[PDB]
């Protein structure tokens, strides 16, 4: 969902 977005994965390097 969000992780598929550059903005999400950006700060979700460890989150996602």
From Swiss-Prot:
Chain spans, region Ser-Xaa-Pro motif, crucial for potent interaction with nAChR: 4-6
Known tissue expression: Expressed by the venom duct.
Residues bearing PTM Cysteine amide: 16
UniProt subcellular location: Secreted
Disulfide bonds listed in the record: 2-8, 3-16
Protein purpose: Alpha-conotoxins bind to the nicotinic acetylcholine receptors (nAChR) and inhibit them. This toxin reversibly blocks neuronal nAChRs (alpha-3/beta-2 = alpha-6 or -3/beta-2 or -3 > alpha-3/beta-4 = alpha-4/beta-2).
Domain notes: The cysteine framework is I (CC-C-C). Alpha4/7 pattern.
Protein family per UniProt: Belongs to the conotoxin A superfamily.
Official protein name in the record: Alpha-conotoxin GIC
């Amino acid at each position: 969902g969000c992780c598929s977005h550059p903005a999400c994965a950006g700060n979700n390097q460890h989150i996602c």
